[PDB]
Design a protein around this ligand. Structure first.
Ligand SMILES: NCC(=O)NS(=O)(=O)OC[C@H]1O[C@@H](n2cnc3c(N)ncnc32)[C@H](O)[C@@H]1O
Length: 441
């Protein structure tokens, strides 16, 4: 089967052969978008093109975009290690039409790449599609132009409980380009738990969302209103890791060549032997987001972007502790990461030493309180009555030991214990009030 690197290249070669300009991945950190925490989609760097505010010399493009979904609109941090399909850091394979072609050709390009004997040659019978319930045009295209049996074409409405809140209406953020979308799913087989999209068991890892094709139609305003974009356009994204899993005949993203090698490296540096422990997968995921974020300019801090980075690093270090790592380990995974990323790791390779030192320093800093804080948490959990850690304790772990509340919640979750988030926030607010009273005007 093809390597992850070969799949990345083949995707780009396909679209290039179809006249799409190959454009380099943007950074994970925007310089000119105040609404965006980290790059969460291939379309981010083309936002102004979709808005009609910018025009490129090309009207169609293709990229393999590094994305982090660990905050803001699209945040999958709490899914990591609990599913076979979710990462913080991942590559999104995309094609884009800037007032060029539209619905039919977008769908045809995707179906051709996926199912043609000349291309990925996926078994057509294992592919399912969803359309936005009101998108009769997309439904007809799949049914009559492509020829998907009706039983595998699923209509999805506003299933997220609000207008335009839907798995089939994609939004860049609370504001920005958005529109109805159609998604392609692959059935990994009945040996995996789960049902098809729209079903009660849709959330299982059996039927995996591979490729989202967005028909960009609106610019969402903060008040929730939808202003039409000047030219209906196309924004698509396919998870490189998810399509690699399909192509490499495995079911989990973590079983692709890239992650198998990386997970072996995690075992080596932590001293773990059971290659099935979920902490190995969590750490393998986390080094990707942490290392690339630092390469793209983020420094650990207690505010904004720096704090999200700090939170992920510390959670990774905590998982290393659970695995029994005896010495500083996280920075040692940068080399191994560079080795599996191919050309997509060039920005990280360029700054290897710098990224390693930032990670080493952060882990060493956290180690000043990690074990002591875990000791306290164990003490408090041992005498805890009920299923919920009190907010005062969570806040003490935060204030004294530098445990982000989500790190505390992560440890507790592994023991089926919840954290009183409201209580934590009340304690934080009480401290804010003390700070105000003491500081004065
Ligand atoms: N602009 C259009 C769009 O963004 N669409 S989409 O939000 O759906 O993401 C595009 C795709 O990237 C993959 N993907 C998304 N999130 C993750 C994640 N946390 N981990 C791994 N793969 C993911 C997934 O295969 C998916 O269909």
């Amino acid at each position: 089967s093809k390597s992850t690197a070969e799949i990345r290249q083949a995707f780009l070669d396909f679209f290039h052969s179809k006249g799409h300009q190959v454009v380099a991945s943007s950074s994970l950190v925007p310089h000119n978008d105040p609404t965006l925490l980290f790059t969460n989609a291939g379309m981010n760097q083309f936002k102004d093109v979709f808005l009609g505010l910018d025009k490129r010399n090309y009207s169609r493009a293709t990229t393999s975009q590094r994305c982090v979904r660990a905050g803001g609109k699209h945040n999958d941090l709490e899914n990591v290690g609990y599913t076979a399909r979710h990462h913080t850091f991942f590559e999104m394979l995309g094609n884009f039409s800037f007032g060029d072609y539209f619905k039919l050709d977008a769908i045809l390009f995707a179906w051709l790449l996926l199912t043609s004997e000349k291309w990925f040659a996926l078994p057509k019978e294992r592919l399912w599609v969803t359309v936005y319930e009101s998108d009769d045009e997309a439904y007809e295209i799949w049914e009559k132009e492509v020829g998907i049996p009706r039983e595998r074409i699923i209509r999805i409405g506003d299933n997220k409980g609000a207008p335009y809140a839907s798995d089939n209406f994609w939004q860049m953020g609370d504001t920005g380009p958005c529109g109805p979308c159609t998604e392609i799913f692959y059935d990994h087989g009945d040996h995996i738990w789960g049902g098809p999209p729209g079903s009660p068991e849709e959330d299982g890892d059996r039927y995996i969302e591979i490729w989202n094709i967005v028909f960009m139609q609106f610019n969402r305003q903060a008040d929730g209103t939808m202003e039409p974009l000047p030219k209906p356009s196309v924004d698509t994204g396919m998870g490189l890791e998810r399509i690699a899993a399909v192509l490499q005949h495995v079911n989990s993203n973590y079983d692709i060549d890239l992650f198998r090698t990386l997970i072996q490296a995690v075992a080596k540096v932590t001293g773990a032997t059971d290659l099935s422990n979920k902490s190995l997968r969590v750490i393998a995921d986390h080094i990707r987001s942490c290392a690339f974020l630092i390469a793209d300019g983020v420094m650990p801090s207690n505010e904004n972007r720096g704090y999200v980075l700090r939170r992920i690093i510390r959670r990774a270090v905590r998982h290393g502790n659970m695995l029994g790592a005896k010495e500083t380990f996280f920075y040692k995974l940068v080399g191994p990461l560079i080795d599996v990323m191919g050309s997509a790791g060039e920005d990280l390779k360029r700054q290897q030493a710098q990224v390693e030192q930032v990670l080493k320093t952060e882990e060493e800093q956290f180690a000043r309180t990690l074990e002591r804080g875990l000791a306290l948490l164990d003490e408090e959990l041992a005498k805890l009555s009920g299923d919920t850690l009190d907010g005062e304790t969570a806040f003490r772990l935060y204030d004294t030991y530098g445990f982000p509340v989500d790190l505390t919640a992560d440890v507790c979750r592994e023991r089926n214990i919840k954290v009183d988030e409201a209580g934590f926030e009340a304690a934080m607010e009480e401290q804010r009030r003390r700070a105000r009273e003491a500081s004065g005007f």
